[PDB]
Every structure is written in structure tokens, then in C-alpha cells.
């Protein structure tokens, strides 16, 4: 069906300025206590998650370079250690990745 008449600017404004079509303000925005960047209450912080994802990417690159094949999945536990660190009595018998970077503050020794 074709429109019978041209819709006027008053009707157009009444339609596309209605509160249903307007953008709602978000009231769940807070500052991340660690880095001070903005984040939502129910969502992980973007800055911190980017840090963790990047560090995980570097660790995965190291542990994939340690393996010469695509199907060489380790059958034992795995431990990541940084420069100036040695495996403990509990970390023996596992596979070890060594990183030249210092241990990050957020990465707990456990």
C-alpha cells in the first residue's frame, strides 16, 4: 500500500522524539577501584580484562612455542613462573613456562 498523503514534520517529530525512541541513561556506571577507569557493575573492567587477556596471550604463545606440534597436549599440570623465580616443592612434576617479564602485581603466587 502507498501512503495517501505526505506526513508532516509535526507528526514526524511527535513520532521520533517520543521517550520510547530516545536513548535511556545508564545508572549502573562506576569507577574501577584498581585502575580508576569506568566500568559497569555487572561487567568486568575493560582495562583489567585487556591486561589479563594480553598476559594470557603471551603465556599461551610461550607454551605453544614450547611444543613442537599442534596435537602435543600436556598430560600433567602446568605452572607459569617469571624471572627470578624457581619452582617450589609442590610445583615439581609439572610442566613449567618461564617468562622474562617480572611477576605482575595482580598475578598472585598461589
Amino acid at each position: 500500500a502507498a501512503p495517501k498523503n505526505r506526513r508532516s514534520i509535526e507528526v514526524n517529530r511527535c513520532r521520533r522524539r517520543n521517550p520510547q525512541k530516545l536513548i535511556k541513561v545508564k545508572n549502573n556506571i562506576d569507577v574501577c577501584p584498581e585502575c580508576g577507569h569506568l566500568k559497569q557493575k555487572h561487567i568486568l573492567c575493560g582495562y583489567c580484562y585487556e591486561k589479563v587477556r594480553k598476559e594470557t596471550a603471551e603465556i599461551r604463545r610461550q607454551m605453544g612455542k614450547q611444543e613442537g606440534g599442534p596435537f602435543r597436549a600436556p598430560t600433567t599440570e602446568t605452572v607459569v613462573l617469571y624471572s627470578g623465580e624457581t619452582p617450589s616443592e609442590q610445583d615439581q612434576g609439572k610442566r613449567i613456562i618461564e617468562r622474562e617479564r617480572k611477576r605482575p602485581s595482580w598475578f598472585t603466587q598461589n
Partner: protein, 153 residues
């Protein structure tokens, strides 16, 4: 009318949904932590828990071995499943996976994303949402109320 439906429709059908879920499960078992769409990760969480249960069921069990063989597309992860993941989940019951919503993707689709992760892995910890300390005003008031309750008890 979709009352009492527990599985959401994904892919090109039920078989495509199963194949997507098994690809996600293989990635999760291999990397110990993956990120994807929120709905796909939510669907995959239950299958991950059940796979850990089947791994705990035993290596010599034929049913568990066949289920692992089907679900782990890469065949080098079945020894990993039966000798790494299940040994470290023994005293636990159902707290095998952790799922957290992360900010939407940067590209134009702006999909809602989640990250799923087997607990106790060899990766940097996620920025978990920590509760407030007892030293806060409200928590200290609640602590005082608890102390008076204990004293009167």
C-alpha cells in the same frame, strides 16, 4: 509458546548446535579459558560441567570414554581430560566452571560476550568482582549487630 524449554536454538539446527557446542568445549578443554558470545557460553557451561563429571566417572568406563571421544574433537585432549582436569576436581561437586560477562565486542556487531574458565588453571586470574570489606561503615554496623546477637545468645 516455549514454556519449559531449556535449550536455545543455535546454528542451522540441532546438529549444528551440537557441533558448535563441541567446538567450544574442545577449545575450553584445550585452553582452560575461552571467550565467546554470552548465549553460547551459557549453553556450553552445563556441557562443560557434565564433561568434567564424565571425566571423574573414570578412564576405564566405556560410556565415559566414548562420550569424551565424541565431544573432544581433538583426540589429544582426552588424556588431558582424564588425567589433568578430573584429578584436580575430586572434592568438588559442581563448581568446575566460572562464567563472567565481559564488555561487548569492539567491532560493529556489539555482541554480548562472556568468558568461561575451568577453575584452578595456570592462567592469570580474572578481575573477579570482590565484595566490600568488613571495615566499611555498613559492614561494621552489621558486625556490631552480630556481636550483640552472639553476646545475647
Amino acid at each position: 509458546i516455549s514454556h519449559g524449554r531449556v535449550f536455545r536454538r543455535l546454528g542451522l539446527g540441532p546438529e549444528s548446535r551440537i557441533h558448535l557446542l563441541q567446538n567450544l568445549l574442545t577449545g575450553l578443554v584445550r585452553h582452560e579459558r575461552i571467550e565467546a558470545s554470552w548465549a553460547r557460553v551459557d549453553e556450553l557451561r552445563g556441557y562443560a560441567e557434565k564433561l568434567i563429571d564424565y571425566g571423574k566417572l573414570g578412564d576405564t568406563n566405556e560410556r565415559a570414554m566414548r562420550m569424551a571421544d565424541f565431544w573432544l574433537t581433538e583426540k589429544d585432549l582426552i588424556p588431558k581430560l582424564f588425567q589433568v582436569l578430573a584429578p584436580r576436581f575430586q572434592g568438588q561437586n559442581g563448581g568446575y566452571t566460572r562464567m563472567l560477562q565481559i564488555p561487548n565486542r569492539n567491532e560493529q556487531d556489539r555482541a554480548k560476550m562472556a568468558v568461561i574458565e575451568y577453575k584452578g588453571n595456570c592462567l592469570p586470574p580474572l578481575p573477579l568482582p570482590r565484595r566490600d570489606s568488613n571495615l566499611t561503615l555498613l559492614n561494621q554496623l552489621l558486625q556490631g549487630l552480630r556481636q550483640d546477637q552472639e553476646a545475647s545468645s
